[PDB]
Structure formats: C-alpha cells, structure tokens
C-alpha cells in the first residue's frame, strides 16, 4: 500500500519575452490538492482539496514564496535557453518540472524524483540514487556540469527524503478518509450491433478510485486480444475515473466472451458475460 506525492510545474514563455505563464499543481496519488496559476487573480497557492484547507497561514505563505522562487528561476532559464538555441522572439517555449516522493505502508521513504524538460523533451533528471544526474544534449550538458560542481543533488535529496516524506504522511493522515479509501468501479456491459454478422460488446467501469485498473477480454477462457479496443482512463470530474474495453464478436457468440476487471477496491476480480 504505497503512496505518492507529485508536483507538476509548467512555464510557458510569451512572445517578446513577456511575463511567462506559470502553472503549478500538486497531487497525492491521483488527487489534486493545491494549484498555482500566474493568470489567476489571487497570485497565491490555492487549495484544491478539503483536507488541505486545514493548513494555517504560515503554510500558504511559504508555499507561495517557494513556487514563486522556482517560477522566477524558470523565467530566467527560458530567456537564457532562447538565446542559446537562437529561437525566434515571436514563439513560445516550455520548461516543465516533475518531482515527488514515494512512501511505503510504514511511511518510510521509498524513491525520489526530480526531472526537467525543455520544449517537450527531457532536459536533466535526478537518477534513482539521488546523487547523480542524467542530462540531455548541449545546453543540458552545461547544466549537468554546473549542478555537479555545486553539489546540487545533495539538497535535492534532502527534500525528497525529508520534507517530501514528512508532509506526504501529514496529507495522508489529514485526508485518510479521502486518500486511503478505495472506491470500487461500477461495472456493466453494453451491446452495439455492427451488422447482421458482427456486434460490439463494450465493458464499462465507472466511478473508481484510484485510476489503476485492468480490463481484459476472454473467449472460452483464453485471453482474447484480437479485435479489441481500449480507451485511456479518463477523469469523471468528481474525483473518480472511467474506462471501457470493447471487442467485436460474431453474432450469436456474445456469451462466449467475458470481461475481467481488476481494481484495488475489488476484493475479488469481477467477471462479466453478456446476458
């Protein structure tokens, strides 16, 4: 029963090197709890979960200061990179940062993350040992040389193994009724004829949390992969998720096919056959 906290930073530059757009979000597993938007009026770290509004004003102050500090640093790097790659002054360019930590059931540190991207492709990443970097080409190679000589990975490791783990447990405890719960999926099957010889059996899974789910078809007990469609897990907008799997079956053989659903909230994996 491991849990995760993840932060996603995004800095998009404006034409003429104007004030760039900065958006930051925070997640505990698949639940967003904080957000920041430079286009928002408050210009503050806003809450996005019921259990995070419990934090006092000292929390929202320091969290607003630290996300501002990173955005201003991404703003300077965006201009430095635009002149490095001689990129047009009338375009937009993006710097993304993803970082977080993993804890086990006992609440101890499992693994850390810290990696950046420029214009959609990997820039520099903190390796799993939290002591070395994996950088891309050219401009990223200067960053790797710069961060190695400054021992920058030491304080990055200190946050991921320290403040990240400490506050992830606090969030998991303050919102245990939201984060440590598993909402099982509500399953059913639909039938959609294609012609007089074929038809589509669609197997639904609605309102489940977390998003990790597995849908598989079978024919006479054997794994059926031929003529199978599977859409990505989509958000329902209420905190839960949706996903369905389809298969084209010949007419009169619908009951030969069974849908199998695996989810954390299910004590036993479900099996659905057309009735």
């Amino acid at each position: 029963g491991s849990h995760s906290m993840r932060y996603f930073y995004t800095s998009v530059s404006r034409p003429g090197r104007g004030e760039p757009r900065f958006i930051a979000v925070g997640y505990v597993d698949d639940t967003q709890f904080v957000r920041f938007d430079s286009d928002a009026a408050s210009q503050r770290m806003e809450p996005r979960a019921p259990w995070i509004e419990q934090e006092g004003p000292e929390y929202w102050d320091q969290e607003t200061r630290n996300v501002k500090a990173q955005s201003q640093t991404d703003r300077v790097d965006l201009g430095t990179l635009r002149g490095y790659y001689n990129q047009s002054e009338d375009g937009s360019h993006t710097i993304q940062i993803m970082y977080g930590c993993d804890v086990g059931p006992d609440g101890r540190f499992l693994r850390g993350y810290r990696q950046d991207a420029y214009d959609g492709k990997d820039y520099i990443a903190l390796n799993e040992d939290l002591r070395s970097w994996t950088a891309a080409d050219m401009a990223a190679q200067i960053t790797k040389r710069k961060w190695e000589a400054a021992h920058a990975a030491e304080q990055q490791r200190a946050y991921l193994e320290g403040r990240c783990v400490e506050w992830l447990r606090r969030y998991l405890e303050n919102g245990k009724e939201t984060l440590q719960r598993t909402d099982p999926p509500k399953t059913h099957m639909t039938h959609h004829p294609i012609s007089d010889h074929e038809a589509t059996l669609r197997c639904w899974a609605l309102g489940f949390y977390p998003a990790e789910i597995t849908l598989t078809w079978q024919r006479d007990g054997e794994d059926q992969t031929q003529d199978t469609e599977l859409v990505e897990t989509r958000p329902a907008g209420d905190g839960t998720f949706q996903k369905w799997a389809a298969v084209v079956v010949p007419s009169g053989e619908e009951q030969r096919y069974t849908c199998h659903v695996q989810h954390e909230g299910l004590p036993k994996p479900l099996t659905l056959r057309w009735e």
């Binding site: 930051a24 630290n66 640093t73 790097d77 990179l81 970082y99 200067i142 946050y159 400490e166």
Partner: peptide, 10 residues
C-alpha cells in the same frame, strides 16, 4: 509542501 531548493539551470 513544495520544493524549497531552487536551482538555476544556467
């Protein structure tokens, strides 16, 4: 709580 160590890439 967000990252408090702000690194300049260049």
């Amino acid at each position: 709580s967000v990252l408090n160590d702000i690194l300049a890439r260049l």
